[PDB]
From a paper:
The cluster of differentiation 47 (CD47) protein, expressed on both healthy and cancer cells, plays a pivotal role in this balance by delivering a “do not eat me signal” upon binding to the signal-regulatory protein alpha (SIRPα) receptor on myeloid cells. As a cell surface glycoprotein molecule, CD47 belongs to the immunoglobulin superfamily and binds to various proteins, including integrin, thrombospondin-1 and SIRPα. SIRPα (also known as PTPNS1, SHPS1, CD172A and P84), which can bind to CD47, contains an extracellular region with three immunoglobulin superfamily (IgSF) domains, including an NH2-terminal ligand-binding V-domain. Blockade of the CD47/SIRPα interaction can inhibit tumor growth by inhibiting the suppressive effects of SIRPα and promoting macrophage activity.
Using a recombinant technology, we were able to make a special recombinant SIRPα-Fc fusion protein named IMM01 with a special SIRPα-Fc structure, which has SIRPα (V2) extracellular segment domain 1 and human IgG1 Fc, with the N-glycosylation modification site of N80A mutation in the D1 region. After Papain digestion, the number of amino acids in the IMM01-Fab is 142 with a molecular weight of 15,241.15, theoretical pI of 7.15 and extinction coefficient of 0.662. The 2.76 Å data were used for the analysis of structure determination. The interface area between chain A (IMM01) and chain C (CD47) is 973.5Å2, which is composed of 29 residues from IMM01 and 27 residues from CD47, including 14 hydrogen bonds and 11 salt bridges. The interface area between chain B (IMM01) and chain D (CD47) is 965.8 Å2, which is composed of 27 residues from IMM01 and 26 residues from CD47, including 14 hydrogen bonds and 10 salt bridges. All the hydrogen bonds that appear in the structure in the literature are also present in the IMM01/CD47 structure. These common hydrogen bonds are stable under different crystal packing styles, suggesting that these hydrogen bonds are important for protein binding. In the structure of human CD47 in complex with human SIRPα, except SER66, the amino acids that form hydrogen bonds are all conserved. At this site between chain A and chain C, there are a salt bridge bond between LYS53 (A) and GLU104 (C) and a salt bridge bond between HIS56 (A) and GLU106 (C) instead. Our data demonstrated the crystal structures of the complex of IMM01 and CD47 on the common hydrogen bonds, the salt bridge interaction and the water-mediated hydrogen bonds.
Author numbering:
A (entry chain C): 1 to 116
B (entry chain A): 1 to 117
Write the structure that this text describes.
């Protein structure tokens, strides 16, 4: 499998303009982004996907601000960023699933809102 | 670039109840991008037995050193076998998508369970 540097949960307040949910594969050996496929899941739904082969990103309308930095993929960073407006509406357990050729893995991070 | 083969070398495996069953599978290519999963039987109501996702299958363990990019062995070991584990097991390649789609399957391995060694 692909192995992850795991995080139980991440907190955000209104200080956070953009929200970042971390996802770090510890054993990426990818030559190219065309070998890699990312899926971010929330409440059973694919709310972000990146197809390296096609070099295309796909979001549902209620996660329109959701994205990853494709520049950082080869380093093993698949962290999801969305506008705080989207984040407050969608708190809970997020699945980050990475594929590299045939190797496959996932990890879960709870996005928590803290009141200040 | 040879059109992918998914090869289960054993057509059948025989094991005593309580022993472990090594179900063998190897691939000739690692493309297209997408994972290997083990099912028991084929068809719509087929049962998922193993994939590489951590802690989802406590009975099944990777026989291969499958954490390496170079790995093309997807053989698995099913511990504490009982007659309820009997059936045909299939090694199936998938293409990535929403959702993932079956690309290629092996010919299958048929596990049978003796009462005594
Ligand atoms: C919110 O911002 C703080 C810095 O003020 C940062 O440490 C924290 O990780 C951010 N949270 C998220 C979920 O982005
Ligand atoms: C997220 O998952 C953890 C561990 O399974 C669970 O304790 C928690 O209740 C879940 N959170 C939500 C918001 O469902």
């Amino acid at each position: 499998q692909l192995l992850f540097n795991k995080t139980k949960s991440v907190e955000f307040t209104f200080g956070n303009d953009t929200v970042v949910i971390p996802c770090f594969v510890t054993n990426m050996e990818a030559q190219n982004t065309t070998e890699v496929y990312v899926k971010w899941k929330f409440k059973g739904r694919d709310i972000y996907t990146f197809d390296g082969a096609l070099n295309k990103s796909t979001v549902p309308t209620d996660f329109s601000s959701a994205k990853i930095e494709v520049s950082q993929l080869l380093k093993g960073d698949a962290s999801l960023k969305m506008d705080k407006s989207d984040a407050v509406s969608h708190t809970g357990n997020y699945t980050c699933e990475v594929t590299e050729l045939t190797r496959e893995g996932e990890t879960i991070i709870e996005l928590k809102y803290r009141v200040v | 670039e040879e059109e992918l083969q998914v090869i289960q070398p054993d057509k059948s495996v025989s094991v005593a109840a309580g022993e472990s069953a090594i179900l063998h599978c190897t691939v000739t290519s690692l493309i297209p991008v997408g994972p290997i999963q083990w099912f028991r039987g084929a068809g719509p109501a087929r049962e998922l037995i193993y994939n590489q996702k951590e802690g989802h299958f406590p009975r099944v363990t990777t026989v291969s050193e499958s954490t390496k990019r170079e790995n093309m062995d997807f053989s698995i070991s099913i511990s504490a076998i009982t007659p309820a584990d009997a059936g045909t097991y299939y090694c199936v390649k998938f293409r990535k998508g929403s959702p993932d789609t079956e690309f290629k399957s092996g010919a299958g391995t048929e596990l049978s369970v003796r009462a005594k060694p």
